[PDB]
Write a protein that binds this ligand. Structure first.
Ligand SMILES: N[C@@H](CCCC[NH3+])C(=O)O
Ligand SMILES: N[C@@H](CCCC[NH3+])C(=O)O
Ligand code: NA
Ligand code: NA
Ligand SMILES: [Zn+2]
Ligand SMILES: [Zn+2]
Lengths: 370, 369
């Protein structure tokens, strides 16, 4: 009971990191124009913050950070620096709303260096966050003493980052809960998905009092990336439907993912949360009898909350035009006769070149909107 | 730290359910021969149990269950039934090693006693499970497991059929169940909200002894705990245990075998075997972290049959992209093979723009060593 009072499950902010973490994705090479498209779409979608690659990284990186701060977006624009006064100056000139100071223990000297940079940023009227890299493989007592010191100085947020992807949910819960007892400020969390824990860790972090979670569209990032944006929203929606459906424009998630999928040349995985081919499907037939209750009894995600029309009850392999129509009708693409013709021409010239895959259905449909 | 004594993180069994949960996957239509292939590959990979679609489901289900029990596999073959005596008779005749009795208050426990004792009298292992355990009345559920434990079963089963359970709620439930019963505990987790691997992990921490998985997680809706994903997690917790128990270098072929049968791509971000799993960004974006990218390698590629993390500077295109990935996968490609692959890769880009998913797709037909 009492700890429910600290839970942030229906009162948190997303720090969208497709334009920071996502630039570490193996196939991400965003140009200025494509970053701007993504920033605008993220803002329309309803995230509170977007984070950008450090403006010290490169020239184009500094220019793009300046351009994005000039767009008039509703969400706040963040970036990050190393703990050097040099970098801080560059960052505050760009027009960002906040700066993360990142350090690694991954001792008395850290506290001193960190104070100069924190007060400089603060004096420029800018939000300041203080974070550690590889927080779960850093000495616990040193880490916490450091957060305590910077809390006494005054920052807006402190950050925990599982950079390596080894943290487990109850381990995260316990650390965040202790951090929540040590500091008086807000708490942001960043979780790598190497072992499948990035969404679970995000959730436990919120339960323990974290106020801000980093996400990435389709989870793109270093290695297999971080907490996916869509995946977190699916989880948080189950916890509080009315909060998530009103805060975000959930019916825009598919277009937002397709925009990134195009840029980084990937297919939306068949089992992607919400938007994957198979996410809103039930098996009909001899295999529906494999559970005791009717398949429709298990619909934790309501399809129309996410812009879709139904669960598809699959009893046979739908092939050709049949597969396209079903998926298109599920996605609310009201396809004209002329559109239906191209698709079955493209879908043929595809299957004739190579034996068709379930993923190809969504792939040939990408170019279409509701 | 006393509860560490109850943890099963380095001492557990996998109940592989590609041939039960997986048949509920939208595009799964396995024939006898394909089931037999998957069952043999699973046994070689080293899982302790496979689960099969109930032999009451259809004629072909019944036939396929019989055939698989006759293959001489090392792993135990399980099936499941409803709490009905007729179903029990069919199941025991098939030659399975174990039967799960699945239910949805006094009437339940009388019927359950009847079925359990029958199965036990055949010298077959018996498991008692509930469907949608996390949306059932807690006190009725636990009283039920207690009663069934006094009768004596080999295992009790918790199933998050709907995919709403959270890791700490899983931990508390399994932990209470471990206090209530004296027997083994199996857990089944759906992945609608991304919690299936975390729930599996927490269940092991709390004393569960058996976890259901599926290849690529395939199952009803977006499926259950994935086989590869669970092993990646469990490998980090105990590398020596996982690497000596499973044949992890056969994971890719195992997934490709299923992927081909159910007509899907291997997702770009798939645990271990996805295009991107063993990649670092090189360049201006390597500077986004403080430490060298190679500091963050919780999974060692050579433990999973791979040769390196690929350090990505530019966009590798054409045969340059194929070569990089084939060398990562230890596919020693002949000049003849390298030729035909370059032929196809263009005879595909000339139909449309290449996804990085395509690289793994054209490589599927190729084996290591
Ligand atoms: N990619 C960085 C992000 C740290 C974010 C800190 N606010 C990491 O994994 O450590
Ligand atoms: N498909 C069933 C499997 C139950 C397994 C119980 N041993 C479910 O999700 O509930
Ligand atoms: Na406090
Ligand atoms: Na006990
Ligand atoms: Zn990161
Ligand atoms: Zn299931």
């Amino acid at each position: 009971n009492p700890s429910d009072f600290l839970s942030r499950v229906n009162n948190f902010s997303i720090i969208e990191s497709t334009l920071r973490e996502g630039e570490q994705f193996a196939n991400a090479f965003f140009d200025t124009e494509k970053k701007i498209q993504i920033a605008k779409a993220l803002d329309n979608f309803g995230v509170d913050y977007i984070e950008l690659t450090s403006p010290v990284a490169s020239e184009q990186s500094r220019q793009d950070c300046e351009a994005i701060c000039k767009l008039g977006l509703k969400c706040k624009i963040l970036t990050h620096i190393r703990c050097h006064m040099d970098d801080a100056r560059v960052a505050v000139e760009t027009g960002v709303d906040g700066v993360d100071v990142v350090i690694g223990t991954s001792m008395t000297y850290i506290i001193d260096s960190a104070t100069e940079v924190i007060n400089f940023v603060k004096s420029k009227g800018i939000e300041v966050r203080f974070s550690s890299e590889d927080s779960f493989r850093s000495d616990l007592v040193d880490l916490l003493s450091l957060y305590k010191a910077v809390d006494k100085i005054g920052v807006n947020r402190v950050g925990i980052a599982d950079t390596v992807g080894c943290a487990t949910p109850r381990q995260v819960y316990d650390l965040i809960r202790t951090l929540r007892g040590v500091v008086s400020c807000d708490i942001e969390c960043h979780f790598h998905n190497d072992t499948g824990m990035a969404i679970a860790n995000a959730y436990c972090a919120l339960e323990a009092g974290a106020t801000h979670i980093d996400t990435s569209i389709l989870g793109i990032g270093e290695r297999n990336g971080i907490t996916p944006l869509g995946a977190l929203l699916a989880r948080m929606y189950v916890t509080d439907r009315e909060y998530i459906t009103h805060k975000y424009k959930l019916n825009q998630l598919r277009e937002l993912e397709n925009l990134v999928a195009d840029a980084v040349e990937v297919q939306i995985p068949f089992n992607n949360y919400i938007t994957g081919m198979c996410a809103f499907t039930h098996k009909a037939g001899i295999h529906a009898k494999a559970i005791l209750a009717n398949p429709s009894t298990y619909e934790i995600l309501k399809p129309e909350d996410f812009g879709m029309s139904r669960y598809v009850h699959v009893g046979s392999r739908l092939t050709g035009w049949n597969a396209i129509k079903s998926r298109a009708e599920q996605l609310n693409l009201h396809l004209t006769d002329a559109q239906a013709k191209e698709l079955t021409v493209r879908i043929k010239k595809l299957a004739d070149v190579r034996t068709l895959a379930m993923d190809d259905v969504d792939r040939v449909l990408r170019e279409y909107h509701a």
